Amino acid sequence: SGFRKMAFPSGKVEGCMVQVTCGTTTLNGLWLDDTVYCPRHVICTAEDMLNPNYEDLLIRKSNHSFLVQAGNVQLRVIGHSMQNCLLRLKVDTSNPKTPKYKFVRIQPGQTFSVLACYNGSPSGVYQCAMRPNHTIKGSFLNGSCGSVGFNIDYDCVSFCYMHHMELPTGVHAGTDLEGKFYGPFVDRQTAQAAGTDTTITLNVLAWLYAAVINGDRWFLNRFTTTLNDFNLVAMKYNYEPLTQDHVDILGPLSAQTGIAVLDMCAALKELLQNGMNGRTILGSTILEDEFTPFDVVRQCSGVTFQ
Ligand SMILES: *C(=O)[C@H](C[C@@H]1CCNC1=O)NC(=O)[C@H](CC(C)C)NC(=O)[C@@H](NC(=O)c1cc2ccccc2[nH]1)C(C)C
Numbered sequence: 001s002g003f004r005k006m007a008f009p010s011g012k013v014e015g016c017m018v019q020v021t022c023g024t025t026t027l028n029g030l031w032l033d034d035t036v037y038c039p040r041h042v043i044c045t046a047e048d049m050l051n052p053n054y055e056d057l058l059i060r061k062s063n064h065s066f067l068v069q070a071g072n073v074q075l076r077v078i079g080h081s082m083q084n085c086l087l088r089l090k091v092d093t094s095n096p097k098t099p100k101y102k103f104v105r106i107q108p109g110q111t112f113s114v115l116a117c118y119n120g121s122p123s124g125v126y127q128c129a130m131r132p133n134h135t136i137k138g139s140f141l142n143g144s145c146g147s148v149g150f151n152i153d154y155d156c157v158s159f160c161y162m163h164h165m166e167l168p169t170g171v172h173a174g175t176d177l178e179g180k181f182y183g184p185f186v187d188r189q190t191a192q193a194a195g196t197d198t199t200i201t202l203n204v205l206a207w208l209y210a211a212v213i214n215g216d217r218w219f220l221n222r223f224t225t226t227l228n229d230f231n232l233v234a235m236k237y238n239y240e241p242l243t244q245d246h247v248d249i250l251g252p253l254s255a256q257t258g259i260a261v262l263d264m265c266a267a268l269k270e271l272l273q274n275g276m277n278g279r280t281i282l283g284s285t286i287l288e289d290e291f292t293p294f295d296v297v298r299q300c301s302g303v304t305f306q
Contacts, residue, residue: 001214003282005127005290006299007113008152015097018075019120020089020146021067028117028146029068029089030162030177032098036068036075036089037177038146039164040082041187049189058082069120070095084179085164085187099157103177106160108132109200109240111292112149114161119143129203129290130161132240133195134183135171138163148177167194200289201239202246205264207288209253210296211281215305219281220259223266230265237272249293257304 020029020038023045029038041049043057043065061080066089068075079090106112108130116124116139128136128149140147140163149161163174164187171194173185185192208219231241247261254261268287276285 001301001305003210003214003299006295007125007127008150010113010115010122010125012097012099012152012155012157013115013148013150014122016095016099017115017117017120017122019067019069020087021069022061022065026119027143028120030146030148030159031068031070031075031091031095032101034091034094036091037086037162038089039162039175039187040085040087040179041145041164042087051190052188054082058087071120082179085175085181086162086177086179100155101157101159104151104158104160105176105178105180106130108134109203109292111290111295112151112160114138114149114163115147116140116144117147127290128161129200130182131171131197132200133197134181134185135167135173135194135197136161137170138172140166140172149174165192167192169194199237199239199287201234201242201268202249202293203289203291204239204287205242205246205250205261205268206253206293206296207282207291208264208268209250209257209259209293210291210300212257212259213253213296213300213304214282216281218279219271219276220263220267221270223270224260224263225266225269227262227265230262230269233269233272239272253293253296256302 016031018029018031022042025042027042029036040054044052063077066077075091077089078092081088111129114128115122145163147163151158159177161174165173175181250261
């Protein structure tokens with residue numbers, strides 16, 4: 001029993017973190033086989049960052065403009081290219097600790113673990129949700145760029161995020177491991193704001209199913225609702241509309257609890273309209289939206305506390 005925001009064991013990823021220096025800028029890189037991936041703004045000076053032309057900045061560098069350090073071992077750069085907002089540095093050694101891996105671009109609402117690193121050295125692990133507005137609420141200081149987000153399936157690390165910047169509201173933006181940003185953001189120290197955000201309805205619902213699987217039913221009710229009548233309540237409270245696809249995804253959790261999806265939607269509508277009345281759900285006083293249906297099935301027991 002219990003329910004916590006759980007990150008994946010970070011071991012396979014720790015063995016891939018290195019340090020990349022260029023000029024006076026130092027950040028982290030990701031060392032898979034004979035390539036190190038890192039944000040391209042590593043090549044910027046402080047004044048380059050306000051309006052950089054990376055194509056022009058990069059052609060002014062050679063292989064030995066880049067210092068790559070793996071623990072105490074220096075790695076020699078033997079090639080370099082720009083892929084979108086990343087640099088790919090080819091090195092003379094292939095990482096013996098390279099795990100089975102993929103590069104994946106995640107969808108909004110999905111979760112992943114972040115390994116926060118400084119100077120190529122892991123320092124912390126926590127779980128994040130890609131928000132609807134394509135930011136994450138991370139915890140990043142100076143020197144954190146090149147930290148990666150990932151999921152682990154079996155033995156395969158699915159890298160899905162690399163960190164680049166912090167927005168004025170204190171939230172974070174970055175790219176997939178092909179260098180394409182999530183959201184409309186660019187790696188420039190310009191005026192850039194997060195779009196308005198929304199609550200991830202599919203995740204709130206999945207977490208109510210988690211609460212029932214762990215033996216709590218106090219928030220349920222005798223009513224039901226149509227998809228359309230729920231979405232009028234969703235609009236009022238700044239929740240994403242629920243689609244038939246979301247209902248289908250919640251199918252297995254509905255089967256393990258015997259609570260029909262639209263019956264749970266009626267429960268949520270009631271929670272939104274009436275509040276929680278000083279009570280908690282899985283230890284929380286608010287409706288939690290950073291757990292996917294996959295997160296719930298992963299963490300919860302397959303047997304309901306009936
Ligand atoms: C990576 O090393 C570093 C990590 C941030 C430092 C603090 N917390 C972080 O996550 N990222 C950077 O330094 C960015 C460099 C590239 C984008 C070229 N720069 C920033 O993150 C600054 N970036 C902004 O984008 C910014 C400032 C600003 C002011 C008004 C309106 C919009 C707006 N965007 C940060 C302020 C540190």
